Amino acid sequence: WKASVDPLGVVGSGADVYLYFPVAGNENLISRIIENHEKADIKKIVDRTTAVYGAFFARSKEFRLFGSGSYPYAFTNLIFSRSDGWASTKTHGITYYESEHTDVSIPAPHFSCVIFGSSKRERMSKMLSRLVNPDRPQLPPRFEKECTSEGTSQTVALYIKNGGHFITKLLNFPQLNLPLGAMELYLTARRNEYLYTLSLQLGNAKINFPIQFLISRVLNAHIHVEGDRLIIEDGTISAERLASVISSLYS
Numbered sequence: 001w002k003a004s005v006d007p008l009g010v011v012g013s014g015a016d017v018y019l020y021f022p023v024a025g026n027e028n029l030i031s032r033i034i035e036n037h038e039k040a041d042i043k044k045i046v047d048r049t050t051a052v053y054g055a056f057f058a059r060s061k062e063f064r065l066f067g068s069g070s071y072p073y074a075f076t077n078l079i080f081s082r083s084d085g086w087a088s089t090k091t092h093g094i095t096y097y098e099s100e101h102t103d104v105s106i107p108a109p110h111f112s113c114v115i116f117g118s119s120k121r122e123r124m125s126k127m128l129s130r131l132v133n134p135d136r137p138q139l140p141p142r143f144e145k146e147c148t149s150e151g152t153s154q155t156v157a158l159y160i161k162n163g164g165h166f167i168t169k170l171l172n173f174p175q176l177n178l179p180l181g182a183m184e185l186y187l188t189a190r191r192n193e194y195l196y197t198l199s200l201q202l203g204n205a206k207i208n209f210p211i212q213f214l215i216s217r218v219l220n221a222h223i224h225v226e227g228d229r230l231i232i233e234d235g236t237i238s239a240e241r242l243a244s245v246i247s248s249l250y251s
Contacts, residue, residue: 001132002108007053007066008147009134010113010127015055015064017166017249018139018159020147023049023069025154025189032243037116037250038101041079041086045104045112048075051150055137056249062117063250064127068150071106080104096124107131117250140184156194158185163200169245170198170237171219179205187242194242197233204228 008018021030023046030052034042046052049069056063080086080097089096097104103124105113113128115121139147139159146157160166163183168176170185181201187194207230216223221235237245 002111005111005131006134007068008055008137008139010066010130011053011055011064011137012057012122012127012130013135013137014057015137016058016161017054017056018137018143018157019052019054019056019246020143020157021052021054022146022150022154022156023051026156028192029156029189029194029239029243032240033246036243036247041084041104042102042114044075044079045069045071045114049112053147058249060118060120060122061250062115062121064122065112065114065116067112067114068110069112071109071112073109076106091125094128098124142186143184146186154188156187158187159183160185166245167200169248171215172241179203187237189239190236192240193236193238196235196237197231198235199226200230200232202228202230 011018023030030046031043034046045067048071049067051068053066054063080088085099086097087099089098094105094107101116103115103121105124105128107113107128113124115124115127143157143159146153146155149155160183164178164180165175166183167178167180168174181203183198183200185196185198187196202225207225212223219232219235222233224231
């Protein structure tokens with residue numbers, strides 16, 4: 001069953017936000033996000049991970065994460081200590097570790113699964129069943145491309161169904177509840193900030209040159225419209241604010 005695993009089919013269909021982080025080049029950002037949510041075992045896992053695939057579900061308030069990495073027995077044995085509030089349970093052989101808000105499995109030496117969030121978060125055995133029968137989420141072409149680029153790219157990818165709501169956060173405005181569609185967002189680290197490009201689905205709504213210029217100057221970015229999509233390129237956001245924007249999905 002480990003022969004062919006699509007991590008996006010494992011985190012599941014129907015998410016409000018899909019995320020992909022190559023760990024190399026994005027260490028500080030991922031550390032900050034983890035810190036915002038509460039400890040050592042998760043950081044330890046990340047330090048052995050090459051790529052993280054994530055899905056956030058607003059209704060059940062949870063993140064589901066899948067990591068590709070190297071998780072040998074000598075490593076796993078030394079984490080999930082009961083003095084840290086981790087309980088283990090035994091199941092087709094696999095061990096599950098549970099805590100108040102975080103469940104973790106290492107179902108094979110190169111895969112990790114983490115489910116974090118409210119008491120309505122998915123059961124680990126249900127996520128693990130998607131190792132055998134995966135879901136089939138639909139993702140945009142560059143997001144799909146980034147997901148198979150580990151080693152060649154360090155671009156962080158997000159796909160956000162409610163792009164209206166996210167754009168206000170990302171651009172530091174207040175919550176307006178804009179009538180806009182899906183957003184694709186691609187970021188790459190420069191020093192302590194991120195450079196990004198995004199596309200935002202506008203629908204039939206027009207955006208005139210005045211609103212365009214003002215956002216543009218606010219962001220110090222190149223902006224244009226293509227068909228029904230607003231394209232922003234060369235925007236910047238600090239790694240600290242980016243981490244907060246992502247963290248703020250939960251709570």
